[PDB]
Structures are given as structure tokens and as C-alpha cells.
Write a protein that binds this ligand. Structure first.
Ligand SMILES: C/C(=C\CNc1ncnc2[nH]cnc12)CO
Ligand SMILES: C/C(=C\CNc1ncnc2[nH]cnc12)CO
Ligand SMILES: C/C(=C\CNc1ncnc2[nH]cnc12)CO
Ligand SMILES: C/C(=C\CNc1ncnc2[nH]cnc12)CO
Ligand SMILES: [Ca+2]
Length: 157
């Protein structure tokens, strides 16, 4: 089956600046900002489509990682699309999970981070609800941490 979900994250940070932090400077800013992410590293590629990034994080006390494959990267339109192409642990009901993200102008000069999540399962298997909730909660924490960090360090590098 194919399932879609929509998240929106509000930020006080202006969209092009937030995109720069999330995308262009991800490898530097994200580990600094996000207290559960230890590193964001390029495994292969030049930064364009097909690039694989390894994001190492702590969960339940254990060091784990996920691999992201860049599907599209469009700074002009503040777009970034990627898929998850590896991780730690046994297979589950997800055959594939991918993301289409866009940043747009929000309130008082801030942003809204839009995310469409596409989950593909085998046959009539359903997405795991607890996981979706946890994933969204991580998304909230991720944007909060980035907002707090960029508020405290509006300049950098
Ligand atoms: C940090 C990574 C993915 C999470 N990125 C984003 N997650 C959510 N919204 C966004 N807008 C621009 N980039 C993103 C690395 O693939
Ligand atoms: C897999 C299911 C929910 C998991 N998804 C979400 N759970 C919580 N908040 C959300 N916002 C957009 N999607 C979600 C429904 O069983
Ligand atoms: C911040 C991001 C994703 C977090 N949201 C979700 N990630 C995974 N599954 C889900 N179901 C509903 N929302 C989600 C994109 O990088
Ligand atoms: C890009 C994001 C998170 C990086 N992925 C994860 N970050 C932290 N703990 C996890 N458990 C499963 N996946 C993760 C957005 O929340
Ligand atoms: Ca960190």
C-alpha cells in the first residue's frame, strides 16, 4: 500500500535562513543544534541527487544511524526531497519511506516547514502508528532545537 502524511513545523526563522541551516549547512548545524543527533556526514556523492548522508543519533540510550538519499535539492524554491535507504534493526512494515519538504514564509517573518511523508508497505500492511507519532515528535523536537540554536547564533561560520 501507499500512505501519505503531512506535517507542518512553524519557526521564527526566515525561510531561506532556515533552509540554509537544514540543507546547505546541515552537516555542521544539525549536530550542534539537535541534542539527539551526533553527526550528519556524506557517505557518497557531491551533495546533489543521489548523495547518501549518514545521520547518527542516540535512541533509547543506543547509538544508531539512518541513511538518507537525496532525491531532489532545489535551493531556489527552498525544496529538499529525500528517502530513508538504511538503518539499524530488523525490517518492519515500511518497504519505503520518503519525504518531500518545502519551506515557506510564515508568521512575523518566520517560516512554515512543510513535509509530505510517503510510506510504501507490502500489500495491505499498514503504517505503524506509534512510529509515526514518535517520528512526528522527533520532527517537532528537531525544528525546536534548530530554532533555539539559530536564535542564539544568527551568524555562524
Ligand atoms: C537533515 C536531513 C533531513 C531532514 N531535513 C529536513 N526535514 C524537514 N524539513 C526540511 N526542509 C529542508 N530540509 C528539511 C538530511 O537528509
Ligand atoms: C499511521 C497513523 C498515524 C501516524 N501519523 C501521524 N501521527 C501523528 N501526527 C501526525 N501528523 C501527520 N501524520 C501523523 C494512523 O494509524
Ligand atoms: C521532519 C521530518 C519528518 C518527520 N515526520 C514524520 N516522519 C515519519 N513518519 C511520519 N508520519 C508522520 N509524520 C512523520 C522530515 O525530515
Ligand atoms: C531528520 C530527523 C531525524 C533524524 N532521524 C532520527 N533522529 C533521532 N532518533 C531517530 N530514531 C529514528 N530516526 C531518528 C527529523 O526528526
Ligand atoms: Ca547534537
Amino acid at each position: 500500500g501507499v500512505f501519505t502524511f503531512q506535517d507542518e513545523y512553524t519557526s521564527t526563522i526566515a525561510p531561506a535562513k532556515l533552509y540554509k541551516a537544514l540543507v546547505t549547512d546541515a552537516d555542521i548545524i544539525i549536530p550542534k543544534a539537535v541534542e539527539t543527533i551526533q553527526s550528519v556526514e556524506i557517505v557518497e556523492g557531491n551533495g546533489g541527487p543521489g548523495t547518501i548522508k549518514k545521520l547518527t543519533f542516540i535512541e533509547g540510550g543506543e547509538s544508531k544511524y539512518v541513511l538518507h538519499k537525496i532525491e531532489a535539492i532545489d535551493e531556489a524554491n527552498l525544496g529538499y526531497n529525500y528517502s530513508i535507504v538504511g538503518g539499524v534493526g530488523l525490517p518492519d512494515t515500511i518497504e519505503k519511506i520518503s519525504f518531500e519538504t518545502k519551506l515557506v514564509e510564515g508568521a512575523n517573518g518566520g517560516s512554515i516547514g512543510k513535509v509530505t511523508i510517503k510510506i510504501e508497505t507490502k500489500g495491505d500492511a499498514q503504517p505503524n502508528e506509534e512510529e509515526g507519532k514518535a517520528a512526528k515528535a522527533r520532527g517537532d523536537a528537531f525544528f525546536k532545537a534548530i530554532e533555539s540554536y539559530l536564535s542564539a547564533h544568527p551568524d555562524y561560520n
